[model samples]
Target: QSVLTQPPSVSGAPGQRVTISCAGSSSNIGAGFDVYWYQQLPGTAPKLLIYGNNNRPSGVPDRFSGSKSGTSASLAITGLQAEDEADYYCQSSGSVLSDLYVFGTGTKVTVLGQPKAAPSVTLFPPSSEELQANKATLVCLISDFYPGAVTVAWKADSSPVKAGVETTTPSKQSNNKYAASSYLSLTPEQWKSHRSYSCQVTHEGSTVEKTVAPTE
Candidate 1:
């Protein structure tokens, strides 16, 4: 089921190196096509990371490089620096038909010599009024995380919910921290059926879960 997959994030101390991998199915990199990589931040534009045949643009630092073979592609960085902190994406055209350049998710690169911060998770329950007509929604707010990347999950009672969950891409806060909202859309019947629901946010090898339950 792999189209093109990448790690959530990669971290390292300055002057160290880090590499982000993008794995593809049989049809992508394995087919020997052009693969591209780049880093971008909000309010700015994408950079000149990859061009013809693993060649980069003049502005891209020599410290960045990309390679592809078989079904794997990677962008590696040498001499990691704080300025390199950002989200990186891998772009590729699979075996080409109409030039479908699939934009796949990539890794967040961070210079982790800075202190790591844990996310604070808060859960909000659906209002009794919103529970009308068998529709309801629950939201989770995760905030203040730095060196920030988080995986969040929704639960119905104690079991992980199978579907109907949406998590926004993590957003940069004004404070240089990060925040994201996760949503669960469920039927009121389903909401009431569960004794409790929680959002589990994972960061720094630890998880924080907050829960809410119906008044009953």
Candidate 2:
């Protein structure tokens, strides 16, 4: 969901002030170019916060900032800090079609910590390939956690499971907190008819669960 477009979230707390918006066009930022930014800190990867249009790439930490007008482009975290949550992307450079790149559909910064903290599920099993013919893999692995927004689910014996299931969009490990992993797939006759298979993991107040059995 890129091609320039963002805003799925934007919270604040620490010091306050948030603003993530990347929605540009006309080739990207109105054709004026210059507008790159990124900061995906939840499970690592995606550094380079602001380049060109705003600078800040030495160690990246000026409260983070960036801007552009025309089409649209922005990333401001002013004083926010809870380690500055994560997710916030935007890029430019494009032509009438695809001269280069044009991405942005990130924007997921929620740094409001007064409580926040809870998560450590772990529920891994089901992976031998068995030859991958029947395909079966399950692994719920949520770690640390702290204002990362989660809500995975998968039950089976308990009912409720969304197809193959897939969840991962909260990462920022390294002890800082926050992690994600929710996957489930079945076949082999629905994994032995499922004796159990849960993986819940809400998160607002708390709700972590783990259960897996068909044979252990």
Candidate 3:
């Protein structure tokens, strides 16, 4: 999957507001995959928000917005309604071909209707570093996402994507938090120069729209 990073969780009291950040790369944003957000409740599926960058889905409420800076995508929920408590996720395709995808670990909302707090986010896999061929391995991971679910794939131009790795639930962490890990294998030549190779993450949320150019 396209290397992506997201915060584990966020907190917002009732009536308060918060924002979650999804970090990727120029290859993902500028390459074109469509950034999207999902609101995941405990027992139900996810809801969609900002897509293409700032567009919302047809039936989605007006409080959600999608934005971007550099290689990162953002989701802002305003007027923090009391019923807004749930987990959130952001995803995009790293390129058009490989069809790999990534998601933030998930953010938690607490307290309910209270004044907004200074919400912050931290991404995993850190900065997008250049991986020179099969010299070393690159990783994509997430933790405590409640409903642990995701997939990975690899593809060449105009070809069907090959599933790489898939995992489910209760992944362990050093701090005891559950985490999930998914990975893909590729040659430098297959990735470094291919124009259509991309990774995309998909979920059961409404669709939104927004556009982001590659982070210089």
Candidate 4:
């Protein structure tokens, strides 16, 4: 997925309100649809939060929310609870379902205790890099991360890329925490006609994505 930018952490006192911001390029959040939300502990899989702008997944606490405009998205948490002190992430459908799904690296919300600095993301697939023979790759380089790693995938036109393969590279962060990378590949025909392709990277319940249109 494309990389995203986010704060390292957001802080609030118990019962207070805090908002986290996630920024993206024209290819992901601003392209269309609502940014999704997720919650995660220091080490574990992420739980679904808001999706499609402001729609909450079944059973998600009412305090979580999502919204987007222009080239950015946001996730808000109200009535901050101590349990809510984990990491928060924002996700969105991108490029084509077959290859795109973007998310922020994650925002650590600390209530009662001091909040940690929110992590930032580097969206990959830098401009003008050509994909040869339906094959391409990008990496979301996340810094200030700890405890766990991230997930990666390719979305093509709103659907997961069945024909595409994905894998994470060994992390190289100075913290020795983890620096993962994912790759996506398609055949020549699959990349024609200005098809939108997305590379999604997720860590600590947040995500970041990057997408590019077919050279056609």
Candidate with maximal TM-score: 1
Tens digits of lDDT, candidate 3, 159-212: 544654343444435643345554444454544444443333322232111111
Candidate 3: worst 10 consecutive residues by lDDT?
A: 117-126
- Candidates in order have lDDT scores of 0.82, 0.81, 0.55, 0.68
| TM-score computed on alpha carbons, candidate 4 | 0.49
Candidate 1 — which residues are off by over 4 angstroms?
1-8, 21-45, 50-58, 65-75, 86-107, 132-134
Model 4's alpha-carbon lDDT is: 0.68
- lDDT per residue, candidate 1, 101-130, as tens digits? 766676778787567888988888988778
Using all chains and alpha carbons, the TM-scores for the candidates as numbered come to 0.70, 0.35, 0.48, 0.49
Q: For model 4, where is the 10-residue window of minimal lDDT?
A: 125-134
Shift in Å, residue 21, candidate 1:
4.8
**In model 2, what is the error at residue 46, expressed in angstroms?**
31
Worst 10 residues of 1 by lDDT: 95-104
Q: Which ten residues in a row have the lowest lDDT in candidate 2?
A: 125-134
What is the lDDT, from 0 to 100, of the residue 195 in candidate 4? Answer: 62
RMSD of each: 4.2, 12.2, 18.3, 15.9
Residue 131's lDDT within candidate 1 is 78
Per-residue lDDT of candidate 4, residues 67-180 (tens digit): 788889888889888788788887766686642777787888756543333245564552234554335544444555443345666787667774656575444366544455
Pairs that collide in candidate 2 are 42-171, 42-172, 43-171, 43-172, 129-132, 145-178
